[PDB]
Amino acid sequence: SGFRKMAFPSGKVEGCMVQVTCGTTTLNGLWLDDVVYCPRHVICTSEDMLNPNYEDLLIRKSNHNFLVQAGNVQLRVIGHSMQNCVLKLKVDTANPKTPKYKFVRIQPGQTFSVLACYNGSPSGVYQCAMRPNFTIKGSFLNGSCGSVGFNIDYDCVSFCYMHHMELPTGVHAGTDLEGNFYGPFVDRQTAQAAGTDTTITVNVLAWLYAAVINGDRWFLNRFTTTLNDFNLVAMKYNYEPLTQDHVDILGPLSAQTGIAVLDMCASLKELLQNGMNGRTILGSALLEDEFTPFDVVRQCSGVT
Amino acid sequence: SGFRKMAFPSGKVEGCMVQVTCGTTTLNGLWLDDVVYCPRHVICTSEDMLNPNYEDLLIRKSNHNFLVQAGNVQLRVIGHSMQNCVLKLKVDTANPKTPKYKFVRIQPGQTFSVLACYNGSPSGVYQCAMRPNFTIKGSFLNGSCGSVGFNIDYDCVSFCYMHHMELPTGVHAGTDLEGNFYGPFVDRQTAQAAGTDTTITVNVLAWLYAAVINGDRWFLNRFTTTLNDFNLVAMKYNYEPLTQDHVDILGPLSAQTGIAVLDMCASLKELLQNGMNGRTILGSALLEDEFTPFDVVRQCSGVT
Ligand SMILES: CS(=O)(=O)NCC[C@@H](C(=O)Nc1cccnc1)c1ccccc1
Numbered sequence A, B: 001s002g003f004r005k006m007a008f009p010s011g012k013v014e015g016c017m018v019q020v021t022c023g024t025t026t027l028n029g030l031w032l033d034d035v036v037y038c039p040r041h042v043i044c045t046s047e048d049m050l051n052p053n054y055e056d057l058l059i060r061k062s063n064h065n066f067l068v069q070a071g072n073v074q075l076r077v078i079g080h081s082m083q084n085c086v087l088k089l090k091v092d093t094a095n096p097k098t099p100k101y102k103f104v105r106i107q108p109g110q111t112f113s114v115l116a117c118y119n120g121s122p123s124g125v126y127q128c129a130m131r132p133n134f135t136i137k138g139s140f141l142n143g144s145c146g147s148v149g150f151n152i153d154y155d156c157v158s159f160c161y162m163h164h165m166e167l168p169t170g171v172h173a174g175t176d177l178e179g180n181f182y183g184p185f186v187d188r189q190t191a192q193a194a195g196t197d198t199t200i201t202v203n204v205l206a207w208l209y210a211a212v213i214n215g216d217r218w219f220l221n222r223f224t225t226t227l228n229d230f231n232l233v234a235m236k237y238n239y240e241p242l243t244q245d246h247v248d249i250l251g252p253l254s255a256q257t258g259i260a261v262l263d264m265c266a267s268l269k270e271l272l273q274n275g276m277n278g279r280t281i282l283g284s285a286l287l288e289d290e291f292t293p294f295d296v297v298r299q300c301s302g303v304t
């Protein structure tokens, strides 16, 4: 009973957080095996961020300039290199708390948990989605850079995000763990605008299925629609176009509830056209799009 | 930038979760030092739950009937006792991962994180509030009993909740770690209805302050009000009456933003009377009441 925006247990990731300081800049790092991963802008002063030449700034840095502290103990840095927008600091000790892990580059619409950190210490955990415009709507302040996003499959942590930047609009941008930004963003104090933040249609449908499973059914109607008809409505409301791939992924939810995907699309169509009329769905007064179909199945079945 | 429903990092609590089985019933336990805490209904069959005499059911149980498994290893049970609605199983080994901890009985309106578990294994973490009617709106399925709620002050975990029951209405009831239920609920398969779920006014005001800090300001108006005037409106909308104690707790937010508490009350009054008119506040289309004033300060300042 009940449905909540749930994050993965963060323990396995808390064991990897370290503090990295270079000169007067301090941020978070991720220690896995004998490498510490952190945003390359750790080498920048606030002045340097206006137009940084990272290769030139990195020449003036030696291994002893990167101060890495794991809780209360100092790690010895024996190598450093830049890969895209991240620095990889080779340390002389393998992290004993290193979990089984993978580095993955997620797709827009996919969800993940964020362990927000400051000074190498965890402050909290929340669930995010990579927006279709490649931004994330997080909760990050100065010093949170290097905090990571991840998913967990039983004992394996798949790291997908490292926080680097806040856009002047209050939304967030970052990289995968290979240092490649999601979207067109660059690690420079230049005004960079985000594109249209469209709604993740397949996620809204998955969340409507979660609502039916948990008892919220008022929005079910007597109608059906087609993909092309639904998509004319999705276009008008800045929703992502629904494809047969999305219908396929919703198959298990459709089978469990006995509500055909296109019938749920017709419920969604009427909700877009008529609004909620002051009613709520799973305690929300808007259509939630940060639950994937996999998230809904996982939460509704009890996967640990 | 940004404001999210954030949970505490759950690592310290994940280290305490164990599986407890008695006969054919399996639920979660909390292992702290040499004691495992779990709901007393672990001794019940599904038939027993209609009208259980726990003292009589417990007489037929010995230490060897309680199977406690910490991950893959079995704990030896050397004592057992019932305290209110919890069982305390004395084991022969102190949990090496026991954090600094306290047992606290929270007040309605206070928030906490829940580490939902199944078979002694964590599935996810989310943020809750103890409702004014002493229920929690969680996400729990059969087998989640024994999952706990907690807060963290730097290195100290304050345990406040243990999950026991789902009401026929889909809301949740449980105990503090001394086994005393929050509210009038009893651990019996009897229909028990929840009282009026009022809105936590001081939390909504705190969340309005979080909105102003993060840029969402459209709801600010040119009006003020008084506590008695505001409370006539709060009464009409099933909001908790606002007291001077609540105004006092909002003082730091009022000082930080320069918006007097009673002026924010007048913004809230107009929002209750006029609705949102299709607009959002911090990505929500309703007034959020599960952030305390302390939660807002902590998130907006970066406390780890
Ligand atoms: C103190 S630090 O080392 O964590 N970061 C300082 C610089 C960083 C930055 O302000 N990032 C930031 C601020 C607030 C929230 N989320 C992210 C930056 C990166 C790219 C272009 C411009 C600025």
Ligand SMILES: CS(=O)(=O)NCC[C@@H](C(=O)Nc1cccnc1)c1ccccc1
Pocket: A001, B025, B026, B027, B041, B042, B049, B140, B141, B142, B143, B144, B145, B164, B165, B166, B186, B187, B188, B189, B190
């Ligand atoms: C399988 S178990 O041992 O975890 N619990 C079985 C009995 C429990 C129960 O169904 N609790 C429950 C179910 C679903 C979600 N949240 C809570 C119960 C407690 C009090 C009165 C009636 C029933």
